Amino acid sequence: SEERREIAEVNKKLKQKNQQLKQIMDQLRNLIWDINAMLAMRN
Amino acid sequence: EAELSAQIRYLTQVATGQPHEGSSYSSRKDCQMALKRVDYARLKLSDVARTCEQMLEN
């Protein structure tokens, strides 16, 4: 029964880890899109 | 007297009375835009590194 609580612990842990990874991924996406747009318009 | 007479002669040869419509503005403008692109990318990299430090910090 304690292993269920262990499961819930690690589930909450990587829930938070996945949301932080989503924020990192969104900021990288936006930086790539901005770089490509700004460099596309220079010509 | 020789140097100043020679330079007044040379200035007589290359004077026009017209205000020289050439410039270098566009290249400075493009260089400023390139530098501000670099600055924008620097600020964004600081933000991504800060979120990575928040993730690894726990």
Side-chain angles (χ1 to χ4, degrees):
Chain A
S1 190
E2 269 198 27
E3 317 184 18
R4 306 182 218 124
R5 315 174 182 194
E6 178 66 79
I7 283 293
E9 190 264 323
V10 190
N11 261 12
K12 204 51 89 192
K13 181 69 175 177
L14 62 93
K15 250 191 212 173
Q16 298 176 124
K17 287 295 197 194
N18 263 6
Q19 291 150 59
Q20 294 162 353
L21 195 47
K22 197 223 292 180
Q23 286 159 34
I24 298 154
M25 196 178 70
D26 287 329
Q27 291 173 16
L28 283 195
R29 273 197 201 125
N30 282 268
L31 175 57
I32 278 168
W33 291 340
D34 296 342
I35 281 179
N36 288 280
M38 288 181 312
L39 289 178
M41 259 326 289
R42 65 185 168 88
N43 318 272
Chain B
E1 207 283 315
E3 290 148 337
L4 259 76
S5 46
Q7 270 154 33
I8 295 176
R9 284 157 181 187
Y10 163 63
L11 278 189
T12 310
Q13 267 148 37
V14 296
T16 183
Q18 291 311 298
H20 197 276
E21 320 166 23
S23 175
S24 82
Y25 286 166
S26 71
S27 317
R28 183 214 314 256
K29 175 70 185 165
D30 291 6
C31 186
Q32 280 172 17
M33 299 323 286
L35 291 170
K36 198 70 210 298
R37 290 191 221 112
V38 166
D39 287 7
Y40 180 85
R42 283 212 311 115
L43 299 196
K44 292 288 178 285
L45 284 181
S46 71
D47 298 2
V48 185
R50 180 194 323 118
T51 57
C52 290
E53 285 145 358
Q54 292 158 69
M55 167 177 178
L56 285 163
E57 203 262 2
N58 294 319

XYZ file of all heavy atoms in Angstrom:
821
model
N 0.823 -1.200 0.000
C 0.000 0.000 0.000
C 0.857 1.250 0.000
O 0.471 2.278 -0.555
C -0.935 0.019 1.205
O -1.882 1.065 1.088
N 2.025 1.157 0.639
C 2.956 2.279 0.640
C 3.556 2.509 -0.738
O 3.941 3.638 -1.062
C 4.060 2.038 1.666
C 3.732 2.607 3.029
C 4.957 2.766 3.909
O 6.069 2.937 3.368
O 4.802 2.719 5.145
N 3.633 1.460 -1.559
C 4.136 1.611 -2.916
C 3.178 2.410 -3.785
O 3.613 3.064 -4.736
C 4.401 0.239 -3.526
C 5.088 -0.705 -2.563
C 5.447 -2.031 -3.196
O 5.484 -2.109 -4.441
O 5.687 -3.001 -2.445
N 1.877 2.383 -3.466
C 0.939 3.279 -4.132
C 1.258 4.732 -3.816
O 1.199 5.596 -4.697
C -0.494 2.969 -3.710
C -0.933 1.537 -3.885
C -2.385 1.413 -3.456
N -2.664 0.160 -2.762
C -3.200 0.089 -1.546
N -3.493 1.194 -0.881
N -3.419 -1.093 -0.984
N 1.628 5.009 -2.567
C 1.997 6.368 -2.194
C 3.334 6.756 -2.808
O 3.554 7.926 -3.144
C 2.028 6.485 -0.678
C 0.813 5.839 -0.049
C 0.880 5.806 1.454
N -0.297 5.142 1.998
C -0.665 5.194 3.272
N 0.057 5.887 4.138
N -1.751 4.558 3.678
N 4.219 5.776 -2.987
C 5.460 5.993 -3.722
C 5.182 6.368 -5.174
O 5.796 7.298 -5.713
C 6.316 4.731 -3.636
C 7.619 4.794 -4.391
C 8.569 5.813 -3.808
O 9.220 5.506 -2.790
O 8.658 6.924 -4.368
N 4.249 5.651 -5.806
C 3.792 5.949 -7.162
C 3.224 7.355 -7.246
O 3.547 8.112 -8.170
C 2.768 4.894 -7.608
C 3.475 3.610 -8.003
C 1.892 5.392 -8.741
C 4.299 3.776 -9.239
N 2.397 7.734 -6.274
C 1.804 9.068 -6.286
C 2.862 10.146 -6.097
O 2.790 11.211 -6.727
C 0.737 9.171 -5.202
N 3.873 9.857 -5.275
C 4.984 10.780 -5.073
C 5.753 11.019 -6.368
O 5.966 12.171 -6.773
C 5.914 10.231 -3.993
C 6.969 11.211 -3.519
C 8.294 11.032 -4.233
O 8.661 9.878 -4.521
O 8.960 12.050 -4.513
N 6.160 9.939 -7.037
C 6.956 10.103 -8.251
C 6.101 10.667 -9.385
O 6.602 11.416 -10.240
C 7.628 8.774 -8.627
C 8.633 8.980 -9.711
C 8.352 8.221 -7.443
N 4.799 10.382 -9.370
C 3.892 10.958 -10.353
C 3.792 12.463 -10.204
O 3.862 13.188 -11.201
C 2.513 10.326 -10.221
C 2.282 9.242 -11.228
O 3.214 8.799 -11.885
N 1.038 8.804 -11.359
N 3.668 12.950 -8.968
C 3.622 14.390 -8.747
C 4.950 15.042 -9.110
O 4.976 16.137 -9.710
C 3.263 14.675 -7.292
C 2.639 16.035 -7.059
C 1.468 16.295 -7.997
C 0.158 15.810 -7.399
N -0.942 15.787 -8.404
N 6.050 14.351 -8.792
C 7.388 14.838 -9.103
C 7.575 15.054 -10.596
O 7.936 16.157 -11.042
C 8.420 13.851 -8.573
C 9.838 14.261 -8.826
C 10.203 15.465 -7.988
C 11.671 15.818 -8.148
N 12.032 17.052 -7.394
N 7.285 14.041 -11.401
C 7.522 14.265 -12.813
C 6.375 14.977 -13.506
O 6.565 15.417 -14.639
C 7.876 12.962 -13.527
C 6.983 11.750 -13.638
C 6.204 11.811 -14.915
C 7.876 10.547 -13.647
N 5.228 15.167 -12.845
C 4.263 16.154 -13.319
C 4.877 17.544 -13.324
O 4.809 18.270 -14.331
C 3.022 16.144 -12.436
C 1.759 15.600 -13.072
C 0.560 15.912 -12.182
C -0.526 14.848 -12.271
N -1.623 15.067 -11.275
N 5.494 17.919 -12.200
C 6.143 19.226 -12.128
C 7.313 19.324 -13.092
O 7.505 20.364 -13.745
C 6.615 19.495 -10.711
C 5.497 19.538 -9.712
C 6.009 19.721 -8.311
O 5.617 20.653 -7.608
N 6.910 18.841 -7.897
N 8.091 18.242 -13.204
C 9.204 18.208 -14.146
C 8.740 18.366 -15.589
O 9.375 19.093 -16.364
C 9.978 16.904 -13.986
C 10.808 16.834 -12.740
C 11.900 17.864 -12.780
C 12.975 17.569 -11.768
N 13.863 18.744 -11.571
N 7.614 17.750 -15.948
C 7.114 17.859 -17.309
C 6.584 19.250 -17.603
O 6.722 19.740 -18.729
C 6.023 16.830 -17.548
C 6.538 15.597 -18.215
O 7.736 15.446 -18.415
N 5.632 14.700 -18.581
N 5.980 19.905 -16.613
C 5.483 21.252 -16.879
C 6.627 22.244 -17.035
O 6.575 23.137 -17.900
C 4.539 21.692 -15.775
C 3.249 20.934 -15.779
C 2.666 20.810 -14.399
O 2.387 21.812 -13.743
N 2.488 19.579 -13.940
N 7.682 22.077 -16.245
C 8.851 22.926 -16.434
C 9.533 22.655 -17.765
O 9.994 23.595 -18.433
C 9.812 22.728 -15.276
C 9.231 23.216 -13.983
C 9.943 22.652 -12.797
O 10.797 21.783 -12.935
N 9.601 23.140 -11.615
N 9.552 21.393 -18.190
C 10.112 21.059 -19.490
C 9.276 21.644 -20.613
O 9.815 22.043 -21.651
C 10.220 19.547 -19.627
C 11.087 19.012 -20.750
C 12.405 19.734 -20.780
C 11.324 17.540 -20.546
N 7.963 21.742 -20.408
C 7.110 22.360 -21.410
C 7.376 23.847 -21.520
O 7.332 24.409 -22.621
C 5.646 22.119 -21.090
C 4.747 22.370 -22.269
C 3.503 23.128 -21.868
C 2.613 22.275 -20.993
N 1.384 22.995 -20.573
N 7.673 24.501 -20.395
C 8.000 25.923 -20.464
C 9.322 26.163 -21.183
O 9.432 27.094 -22.003
C 8.041 26.523 -19.071
C 6.682 26.715 -18.473
C 6.739 26.810 -16.978
O 7.697 27.339 -16.419
N 5.718 26.292 -16.311
N 10.325 25.321 -20.905
C 11.610 25.421 -21.599
C 11.428 25.203 -23.093
O 11.979 25.945 -23.924
C 12.610 24.413 -21.013
C 12.885 24.714 -19.553
C 13.900 24.442 -21.768
C 13.317 23.506 -18.780
N 10.600 24.227 -23.452
C 10.390 23.893 -24.850
C 9.642 24.993 -25.582
O 9.954 25.300 -26.741
C 9.627 22.584 -24.927
C 9.655 21.927 -26.248
S 8.770 20.391 -26.092
C 7.131 21.056 -25.887
N 8.670 25.619 -24.918
C 7.946 26.723 -25.532
C 8.843 27.926 -25.754
O 8.748 28.590 -26.793
C 6.753 27.110 -24.677
C 5.649 26.103 -24.759
O 5.518 25.466 -25.824
O 4.914 25.932 -23.764
N 9.734 28.208 -24.805
C 10.612 29.355 -24.995
C 11.630 29.101 -26.094
O 11.966 30.019 -26.852
C 11.295 29.712 -23.691
C 10.358 30.273 -22.675
C 11.020 30.446 -21.348
O 12.242 30.431 -21.253
N 10.228 30.614 -20.310
N 12.076 27.855 -26.242
C 12.982 27.541 -27.340
C 12.290 27.648 -28.686
O 12.880 28.155 -29.650
C 13.542 26.146 -27.174
C 14.636 25.952 -26.148
C 15.267 24.634 -26.433
C 15.657 27.042 -26.246
N 11.045 27.172 -28.759
C 10.256 27.290 -29.979
C 10.071 28.738 -30.375
O 10.221 29.099 -31.551
C 8.890 26.672 -29.773
C 8.784 25.234 -30.025
C 7.331 24.943 -30.171
N 7.016 23.549 -29.948
C 6.121 23.139 -29.064
N 5.474 24.029 -28.327
N 5.874 21.847 -28.921
N 9.739 29.582 -29.403
C 9.490 30.976 -29.712
C 10.758 31.685 -30.133
O 10.723 32.497 -31.058
C 8.860 31.663 -28.518
C 7.404 31.355 -28.399
O 6.564 32.080 -28.919
N 7.086 30.257 -27.731
N 11.893 31.339 -29.525
C 13.151 31.948 -29.934
C 13.540 31.529 -31.347
O 14.019 32.361 -32.129
C 14.238 31.578 -28.939
C 15.650 32.027 -29.257
C 15.700 33.516 -29.429
C 16.530 31.616 -28.124
N 13.299 30.269 -31.702
C 13.613 29.796 -33.049
C 12.727 30.478 -34.078
O 13.204 30.915 -35.136
C 13.473 28.269 -33.104
C 14.720 27.625 -32.561
C 13.258 27.773 -34.499
C 14.534 26.179 -32.334
N 11.438 30.615 -33.765
C 10.512 31.271 -34.681
C 10.861 32.741 -34.865
O 10.805 33.259 -35.990
C 9.085 31.134 -34.172
C 8.537 29.762 -34.215
C 8.982 28.736 -34.963
C 7.429 29.266 -33.475
N 8.222 27.625 -34.746
C 7.262 27.929 -33.826
C 6.564 29.823 -32.543
C 6.277 27.139 -33.273
C 5.585 29.039 -32.001
C 5.447 27.716 -32.366
N 11.262 33.416 -33.787
C 11.628 34.824 -33.895
C 12.899 35.003 -34.700
O 12.995 35.941 -35.502
C 11.805 35.430 -32.516
C 10.531 35.430 -31.716
O 9.455 35.284 -32.328
O 10.604 35.543 -30.473
N 13.873 34.115 -34.506
C 15.117 34.188 -35.259
C 14.849 34.000 -36.739
O 15.337 34.771 -37.571
C 16.115 33.155 -34.721
C 16.767 33.684 -33.457
C 17.179 32.842 -35.733
C 17.729 32.723 -32.852
N 14.007 33.029 -37.085
C 13.741 32.772 -38.495
C 12.933 33.887 -39.131
O 13.192 34.247 -40.279
C 13.027 31.447 -38.656
C 13.925 30.296 -38.410
O 14.688 29.907 -39.279
N 13.867 29.745 -37.211
N 12.003 34.489 -38.393
C 11.219 35.579 -38.962
C 12.074 36.818 -39.185
O 12.050 37.416 -40.274
C 10.042 35.907 -38.055
N 12.858 37.191 -38.173
C 13.693 38.378 -38.269
C 14.773 38.211 -39.329
O 15.077 39.152 -40.058
C 14.305 38.681 -36.909
C 13.314 39.223 -35.909
S 14.028 39.620 -34.311
C 14.955 38.137 -33.980
N 15.343 37.013 -39.451
C 16.322 36.787 -40.499
C 15.689 36.611 -41.865
O 16.375 36.776 -42.870
C 17.163 35.567 -40.179
C 18.135 35.745 -39.035
C 18.847 34.450 -38.821
C 19.104 36.832 -39.373
N 14.420 36.238 -41.932
C 13.787 36.137 -43.233
C 13.484 37.514 -43.786
O 13.531 37.723 -45.001
C 12.516 35.302 -43.137
N 13.189 38.468 -42.914
C 12.809 39.776 -43.429
C 13.980 40.656 -43.840
O 13.744 41.744 -44.368
C 11.968 40.545 -42.416
C 10.487 40.512 -42.699
S 10.061 40.503 -44.448
C 10.495 42.169 -44.919
N 15.229 40.242 -43.617
C 16.342 41.158 -43.862
C 16.677 41.282 -45.337
O 17.356 42.230 -45.736
C 17.577 40.725 -43.089
C 18.129 39.410 -43.520
C 19.273 39.005 -42.633
N 19.638 37.617 -42.849
C 20.502 37.212 -43.764
N 21.101 38.094 -44.544
N 20.768 35.920 -43.888
N 16.200 40.360 -46.152
C 16.583 40.320 -47.552
C 15.790 41.330 -48.374
O 16.035 42.535 -48.298
C 16.396 38.905 -48.099
C 16.867 37.837 -47.120
O 18.037 37.463 -47.109
N 15.944 37.334 -46.299
N 54.464 79.842 -48.342
C 53.749 80.364 -49.505
C 53.530 79.280 -50.548
O 52.455 79.201 -51.155
C 54.526 81.531 -50.115
C 53.671 82.552 -50.865
C 53.243 82.086 -52.233
O 54.095 81.550 -52.971
O 52.051 82.248 -52.570
N 54.532 78.424 -50.746
C 54.443 77.373 -51.752
C 53.369 76.357 -51.396
O 52.529 76.008 -52.237
C 55.795 76.687 -51.912
N 53.369 75.891 -50.145
C 52.391 74.903 -49.704
C 50.978 75.457 -49.749
O 50.055 74.782 -50.225
C 52.719 74.430 -48.293
C 53.959 73.576 -48.197
C 54.681 73.759 -46.878
O 54.488 74.812 -46.237
O 55.448 72.859 -46.486
N 50.788 76.698 -49.296
C 49.435 77.234 -49.269
C 48.932 77.563 -50.668
O 47.747 77.371 -50.958
C 49.354 78.450 -48.360
C 48.745 78.077 -47.010
C 49.733 77.346 -46.143
C 48.210 79.301 -46.310
N 49.819 78.015 -51.558
C 49.401 78.262 -52.930
C 49.040 76.965 -53.633
O 48.040 76.908 -54.365
C 50.505 78.984 -53.687
O 51.753 78.371 -53.433
N 49.818 75.907 -53.391
C 49.526 74.612 -53.988
C 48.204 74.056 -53.484
O 47.434 73.469 -54.250
C 50.658 73.630 -53.695
N 47.902 74.272 -52.206
C 46.660 73.723 -51.681
C 45.455 74.537 -52.111
O 44.372 73.979 -52.302
C 46.738 73.593 -50.170
C 47.269 72.246 -49.791
C 47.939 72.247 -48.450
O 47.548 72.981 -47.547
N 48.971 71.431 -48.313
N 45.615 75.850 -52.315
C 44.502 76.618 -52.876
C 44.269 76.225 -54.332
O 43.124 76.142 -54.791
C 44.737 78.127 -52.708
C 44.734 78.499 -51.236
C 43.638 78.943 -53.365
C 45.044 79.954 -50.976
N 45.343 75.887 -55.055
C 45.180 75.407 -56.426
C 44.468 74.061 -56.466
O 43.551 73.850 -57.273
C 46.540 75.299 -57.104
C 47.131 76.627 -57.521
C 48.633 76.517 -57.650
N 49.238 77.785 -58.035
C 50.519 77.931 -58.343
N 51.330 76.884 -58.316
N 50.991 79.121 -58.687
N 44.872 73.147 -55.584
C 44.248 71.832 -55.535
C 42.797 71.935 -55.096
O 41.935 71.212 -55.606
C 45.035 70.918 -54.607
C 44.281 69.695 -54.176
C 43.870 68.745 -55.098
C 43.994 69.478 -52.839
C 43.176 67.627 -54.701
C 43.309 68.360 -52.434
C 42.902 67.439 -53.369
O 42.217 66.324 -52.964
N 42.498 72.856 -54.179
C 41.116 73.070 -53.776
C 40.311 73.704 -54.894
O 39.100 73.493 -54.986
C 41.064 73.934 -52.523
C 41.284 73.191 -51.211
C 40.985 74.107 -50.052
C 40.417 71.956 -51.148
N 40.963 74.484 -55.751
C 40.267 75.029 -56.907
C 39.947 73.920 -57.901
O 38.936 73.972 -58.608
C 41.119 76.125 -57.551
O 41.534 77.050 -56.543
C 40.322 76.894 -58.587
N 40.776 72.880 -57.932
C 40.531 71.812 -58.893
C 39.395 70.892 -58.463
O 38.740 70.281 -59.312
C 41.807 71.011 -59.125
C 42.617 71.525 -60.297
C 44.103 71.333 -60.109
O 44.546 70.331 -59.548
N 44.888 72.298 -60.577
N 39.135 70.767 -57.159
C 38.151 69.780 -56.712
C 36.984 70.404 -55.960
O 36.288 69.718 -55.203
C 38.806 68.686 -55.847
C 39.799 67.884 -56.655
C 39.462 69.283 -54.619
N 36.722 71.682 -56.177
C 35.566 72.334 -55.582
C 34.400 72.225 -56.548
O 34.599 72.208 -57.765
C 35.842 73.803 -55.266
N 33.186 72.126 -56.009
C 32.000 72.086 -56.844
C 30.867 72.983 -56.387
O 29.991 73.289 -57.200
C 31.467 70.652 -56.957
O 30.347 70.638 -57.848
C 31.047 70.124 -55.608
N 30.841 73.407 -55.129
C 29.725 74.195 -54.659
C 28.433 73.432 -54.495
O 27.371 74.054 -54.438
N 28.490 72.116 -54.429
C 27.315 71.271 -54.321
C 27.480 70.351 -53.123
O 28.596 69.943 -52.795
C 27.113 70.475 -55.615
C 26.705 71.356 -56.765
C 25.570 72.281 -56.399
O 24.475 71.843 -56.057
N 25.827 73.577 -56.466
N 26.387 70.014 -52.441
C 26.530 69.532 -51.063
C 26.786 68.038 -50.889
O 26.537 67.540 -49.787
C 25.197 69.945 -50.433
C 24.248 69.917 -51.541
C 24.993 70.391 -52.734
N 27.237 67.315 -51.921
C 27.630 65.903 -51.819
C 26.540 64.952 -51.354
O 26.518 64.571 -50.186
C 28.832 65.669 -50.903
C 29.464 64.330 -51.119
N 28.997 63.181 -50.523
C 30.488 63.947 -51.914
C 29.715 62.150 -50.928
N 30.633 62.590 -51.767
N 25.633 64.578 -52.240
C 24.464 63.786 -51.887
C 24.747 62.332 -51.518
O 23.797 61.556 -51.402
C 23.487 63.815 -53.051
C 23.415 65.179 -53.683
C 22.738 65.170 -55.026
O 21.946 64.241 -55.290
O 23.004 66.093 -55.822
N 25.996 61.923 -51.323
C 26.266 60.584 -50.850
C 26.120 60.467 -49.345
O 26.118 61.455 -48.616
N 26.010 59.224 -48.875
C 25.818 58.950 -47.455
C 26.137 57.502 -47.150
O 26.402 56.698 -48.044
C 24.392 59.237 -47.009
O 24.212 58.842 -45.664
N 26.096 57.182 -45.861
C 26.298 55.828 -45.369
C 25.249 55.424 -44.353
O 25.578 54.744 -43.380
C 27.670 55.691 -44.726
O 27.605 56.166 -43.401
N 24.001 55.843 -44.533
C 23.021 55.679 -43.470
C 22.439 54.281 -43.442
O 22.215 53.725 -42.359
C 21.910 56.702 -43.630
C 22.303 58.099 -43.244
C 21.520 59.173 -43.597
C 23.456 58.345 -42.529
C 21.869 60.442 -43.251
C 23.814 59.610 -42.186
C 23.018 60.653 -42.547
O 23.362 61.930 -42.203
N 22.178 53.705 -44.618
C 21.472 52.433 -44.704
C 22.280 51.298 -44.097
O 21.714 50.399 -43.462
C 21.147 52.121 -46.153
O 22.328 51.791 -46.850
N 23.594 51.336 -44.258
C 24.426 50.278 -43.712
C 24.483 50.361 -42.197
O 24.487 49.331 -41.515
C 25.815 50.349 -44.315
O 25.720 50.585 -45.707
N 24.478 51.576 -41.660
C 24.412 51.743 -40.218
C 23.078 51.267 -39.674
O 23.022 50.663 -38.594
C 24.643 53.198 -39.853
C 24.653 53.458 -38.379
C 24.074 54.810 -38.100
N 24.628 55.802 -39.007
C 25.554 56.688 -38.662
N 26.023 56.705 -37.425
N 26.006 57.557 -39.552
N 22.007 51.497 -40.431
C 20.689 51.034 -40.018
C 20.625 49.516 -39.964
O 20.132 48.937 -38.986
C 19.633 51.576 -40.965
C 18.272 51.060 -40.675
C 17.778 51.649 -39.391
C 16.460 51.057 -38.994
N 16.172 51.379 -37.582
N 21.146 48.860 -40.998
C 21.147 47.402 -41.013
C 22.047 46.825 -39.938
O 21.713 45.794 -39.342
C 21.571 46.894 -42.378
C 20.542 47.178 -43.431
O 19.554 47.864 -43.108
O 20.709 46.718 -44.577
N 23.156 47.496 -39.639
C 24.017 47.012 -38.572
C 23.350 47.160 -37.215
O 23.490 46.278 -36.351
C 25.342 47.753 -38.602
S 26.514 47.117 -37.440
N 22.579 48.231 -37.025
C 21.861 48.411 -35.769
C 20.776 47.367 -35.596
O 20.574 46.847 -34.489
C 21.252 49.801 -35.708
C 22.227 50.866 -35.326
C 21.641 52.249 -35.473
O 20.428 52.411 -35.560
N 22.503 53.257 -35.511
N 20.082 47.025 -36.685
C 19.071 45.980 -36.594
C 19.697 44.626 -36.298
O 19.134 43.839 -35.529
C 18.247 45.907 -37.873
C 17.473 47.153 -38.215
S 16.805 47.989 -36.782
C 15.463 46.906 -36.341
N 20.872 44.350 -36.869
C 21.546 43.084 -36.588
C 21.974 42.987 -35.129
O 21.805 41.936 -34.486
C 22.751 42.925 -37.501
N 22.483 44.087 -34.585
C 22.884 44.084 -33.187
C 21.686 43.959 -32.260
O 21.778 43.299 -31.215
C 23.668 45.344 -32.874
C 25.023 45.375 -33.557
C 25.640 46.729 -33.401
C 25.898 44.335 -32.940
N 20.541 44.524 -32.637
C 19.385 44.378 -31.765
C 18.783 42.980 -31.863
O 18.215 42.493 -30.878
C 18.347 45.453 -32.070
C 17.339 45.631 -30.953
C 17.933 46.255 -29.704
C 17.208 45.787 -28.435
N 15.777 46.161 -28.371
N 18.925 42.312 -33.012
C 18.588 40.893 -33.093
C 19.420 40.071 -32.128
O 18.896 39.197 -31.424
C 18.815 40.361 -34.497
C 17.879 40.841 -35.531
C 18.067 40.039 -36.778
N 18.009 40.887 -37.953
C 19.049 41.133 -38.729
N 20.209 40.570 -38.459
N 18.923 41.923 -39.775
N 20.724 40.347 -32.089
C 21.613 39.632 -31.177
C 21.231 39.894 -29.724
O 21.200 38.969 -28.898
C 23.066 40.014 -31.477
C 23.986 39.579 -30.374
C 23.495 39.374 -32.758
N 20.858 41.135 -29.405
C 20.472 41.462 -28.032
C 19.179 40.773 -27.621
O 19.053 40.302 -26.481
C 20.331 42.966 -27.878
C 21.661 43.671 -27.863
O 22.688 42.998 -28.100
O 21.687 44.894 -27.616
N 18.211 40.705 -28.542
C 16.966 39.997 -28.277
C 17.221 38.523 -28.013
O 16.643 37.939 -27.078
C 16.030 40.180 -29.465
C 14.693 39.503 -29.351
C 13.642 40.122 -28.708
C 14.471 38.264 -29.921
C 12.421 39.513 -28.609
C 13.251 37.649 -29.822
C 12.233 38.279 -29.168
O 11.009 37.667 -29.073
N 18.112 37.916 -28.800
C 18.432 36.511 -28.588
C 19.154 36.302 -27.266
O 18.959 35.275 -26.606
C 19.274 35.982 -29.739
N 19.955 37.280 -26.841
C 20.637 37.161 -25.559
C 19.657 37.187 -24.395
O 19.784 36.389 -23.453
C 21.647 38.283 -25.399
C 22.920 38.089 -26.172
C 24.097 38.716 -25.452
N 23.825 40.082 -25.026
C 23.767 40.467 -23.758
N 23.957 39.584 -22.791
N 23.507 41.732 -23.458
N 18.672 38.089 -24.450
C 17.673 38.151 -23.385
C 16.854 36.875 -23.318
O 16.586 36.347 -22.225
C 16.743 39.336 -23.594
C 17.366 40.721 -23.599
C 16.273 41.741 -23.420
C 18.405 40.863 -22.508
N 16.475 36.347 -24.482
C 15.703 35.113 -24.490
C 16.516 33.930 -23.985
O 15.970 33.077 -23.274
C 15.180 34.847 -25.887
C 14.156 35.855 -26.302
C 12.879 35.629 -25.552
C 11.860 36.671 -25.931
N 12.184 37.976 -25.305
N 17.814 33.885 -24.287
C 18.638 32.795 -23.776
C 18.802 32.887 -22.273
O 18.868 31.859 -21.588
C 20.001 32.803 -24.449
C 19.998 32.263 -25.862
C 21.379 32.294 -26.422
C 19.451 30.879 -25.864
N 18.855 34.109 -21.742
C 18.886 34.281 -20.297
C 17.621 33.743 -19.648
O 17.683 33.082 -18.605
C 19.062 35.747 -19.949
O 17.878 36.455 -20.255
N 16.471 33.972 -20.283
C 15.221 33.469 -19.717
C 15.137 31.946 -19.770
O 14.658 31.316 -18.813
C 14.036 34.083 -20.442
C 13.987 35.576 -20.281
O 14.901 36.126 -19.636
O 13.041 36.202 -20.800
N 15.596 31.336 -20.866
C 15.551 29.876 -20.955
C 16.505 29.251 -19.949
O 16.168 28.257 -19.288
C 15.860 29.400 -22.384
C 15.693 27.919 -22.476
C 14.933 30.034 -23.350
N 17.689 29.848 -19.775
C 18.633 29.337 -18.789
C 18.102 29.505 -17.376
O 18.348 28.659 -16.512
C 19.975 30.040 -18.936
N 17.323 30.557 -17.138
C 16.752 30.745 -15.813
C 15.665 29.721 -15.520
O 15.585 29.213 -14.392
C 16.215 32.161 -15.700
C 15.589 32.505 -14.384
C 14.804 33.795 -14.479
N 15.447 34.772 -15.354
C 14.904 35.245 -16.469
N 13.707 34.826 -16.849
N 15.560 36.129 -17.212
N 14.854 29.368 -16.517
C 13.863 28.315 -16.291
C 14.522 26.950 -16.142
O 14.036 26.105 -15.383
C 12.842 28.287 -17.422
O 13.519 28.095 -18.668
C 12.078 29.578 -17.469
N 15.641 26.724 -16.834
C 16.384 25.481 -16.645
C 16.983 25.392 -15.254
O 17.016 24.308 -14.661
C 17.488 25.348 -17.683
S 16.917 25.062 -19.352
N 17.453 26.518 -14.718
C 17.971 26.522 -13.358
C 16.858 26.300 -12.348
O 17.073 25.647 -11.323
C 18.685 27.831 -13.074
C 20.038 27.923 -13.721
C 20.360 29.331 -14.165
O 19.499 30.211 -13.990
O 21.474 29.555 -14.684
N 15.661 26.823 -12.624
C 14.536 26.550 -11.737
C 14.123 25.092 -11.781
O 13.689 24.546 -10.761
C 13.336 27.407 -12.099
C 13.515 28.866 -11.832
C 12.577 29.689 -12.667
O 11.364 29.667 -12.455
N 13.120 30.393 -13.644
N 14.235 24.452 -12.938
C 13.859 23.047 -13.013
C 14.892 22.169 -12.320
O 14.542 21.284 -11.531
C 13.676 22.619 -14.463
C 13.596 21.125 -14.638
S 13.308 20.613 -16.327
C 13.330 18.838 -16.135
N 16.172 22.413 -12.585
C 17.219 21.605 -11.974
C 17.400 21.919 -10.499
O 18.017 21.133 -9.771
C 18.535 21.818 -12.705
C 18.628 21.139 -14.055
C 19.760 21.751 -14.836
C 18.844 19.664 -13.854
N 16.878 23.057 -10.040
C 17.150 23.517 -8.686
C 16.424 22.696 -7.632
O 16.837 22.699 -6.468
C 16.759 24.990 -8.575
C 17.454 25.747 -7.469
C 16.596 25.871 -6.229
O 15.470 25.327 -6.225
O 17.044 26.518 -5.264
N 15.382 21.969 -8.008
C 14.621 21.202 -7.037
C 14.978 19.728 -7.117
O 15.558 19.280 -8.101
C 13.127 21.401 -7.262
C 12.684 22.818 -6.974
O 13.126 23.434 -6.006
N 11.808 23.345 -7.822
